[PDB]
Amino acid sequence: MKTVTVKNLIIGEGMPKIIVSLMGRDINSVKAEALAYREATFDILEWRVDHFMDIASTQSVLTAARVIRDAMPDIPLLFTFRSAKEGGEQTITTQHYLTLNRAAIDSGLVDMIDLELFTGDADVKATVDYAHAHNVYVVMSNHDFHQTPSAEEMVLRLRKMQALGADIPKIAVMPQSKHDVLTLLTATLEMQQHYADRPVITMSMAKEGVISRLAGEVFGSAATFGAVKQASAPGQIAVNDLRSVLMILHNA
Amino acid sequence: MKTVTVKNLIIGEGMPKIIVSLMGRDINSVKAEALAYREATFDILEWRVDHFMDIASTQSVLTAARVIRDAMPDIPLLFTFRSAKEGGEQTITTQHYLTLNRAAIDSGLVDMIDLELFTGDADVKATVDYAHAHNVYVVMSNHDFHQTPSAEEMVLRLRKMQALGADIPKIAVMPQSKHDVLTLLTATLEMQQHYADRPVITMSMAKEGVISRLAGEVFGSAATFGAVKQASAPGQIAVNDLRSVLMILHNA
Ligand SMILES: *C[C@H]1C[C@@H](C(=O)O)C[C@@H](O)[C@@H]1O
Ligand SMILES: *C[C@H]1C[C@@H](C(=O)O)C[C@@H](O)[C@@H]1O
Q: Which helix (H) or strand (E) holds B77?
A: strand B77-80
Residue B76 CA to ligand 2 center (angstroms) comes to 16
Ligand 1: list residues with CB < 6 Å. Answer: A 21, 46, 48, 80, 82, 141, 170, 172, 203, 205, 225, 232-233, 236
In this structure, are residues B89 and B54 in contact, taking their beta carbons and an 8 Å threshold?
A: no
At A35 the three-state DSSP class reads helix
Neighbours of B174 (CB within 10 A): 22
- Residues A199 and A4: their CA atoms lie apart, in Å, by 8
The answer to whether residue A247 neighbours chain B at the CB level (below 8 Å) is no
Q: Are A108 and A136 in contact (CB under 8 A)?
A: no
Residue B10: strand pairing partners? B5
Which ranges in A114-177 belong to alpha helices (H)?
A: 121-133, 151-163
Record the resolution, in angstroms. Answer: 1.0
Strand-pair category, B77-80 with A17-22:
unpaired
Closest approach of A108 to chain B, Cα-based (Å): 37
CB contact under 8 A, A215 and B219: no
Round to whole Å and give the CA distance between B16 and B47.
19
**Ligand 2 neighbourhood includes B213 CB (under 6 angstroms):** no
Would you say B211 and B181 are in contact if contact means Cβ atoms under 8 Å apart? Answer: yes
- Strands B137-144, B112-116: pairing is parallel
CB atoms A249 and B211 under 8 Å: yes
Q: Which residues of B touch A192 (CB under 8 A)?
A: 178
CB atoms within 10 A of CB B62: 16
How far apart CA A215 and CA B215 sit, in angstroms, is 10
Q: Which atom of ligand 2 is nearest to the CA of B213?
A: 7
CA of A232 from ligand 1 middle (Å) equals 6
The experimental technique used to determine this model is X-ray
Orientation of helix A94-107 relative to helix A121-133, angle to 10°: 10
Task: Answer yes or no: do B211 and A210 touch at CB < 8 A.
Answer: no
Do A208 and B186 count as a contact with CB atoms less than 8 A apart? no
CA A238 – CA A231 distance, rounded (Å): 8
Q: Is the CB of B61 under 6 A from ligand 2?
A: no
For chain B, the straight-line distance linking the first and the last C-alpha, in angstroms and rounded, comes to 24
B56 — contact with chain A (CB < 8 Å)?
A: no
Structural domain boundaries, residue A24? 1-252
Instruction: Choose among A178, A208, A237: nearest Cβ to B248.
Output: A237
Active site residue A143: yes
Report the DSSP beta bridge partners of residue B118. Answer: none
**Which residue ranges of A make up the annotated binding site for 3-dehydroquinate?**
21, 46-48, 82, 213, 232, 236
Helix (H) or strand (E) holding A235: none
CATH (domain of A142): 3.20.20.70
Query: Of how many residues is chain A composed?
Result: 252
A201 CA from centroid of ligand 1 (Å):
10
Cβ-contact A22, A220 below 8 angstroms: no
Please count the structural domains in chain B: 1
Inform me whether the C-beta atom of residue A246 falls under 8 Å from chain B C-beta atoms. no
Are the Cβ atoms of B252 and A185 closer than 8 angstroms?
no
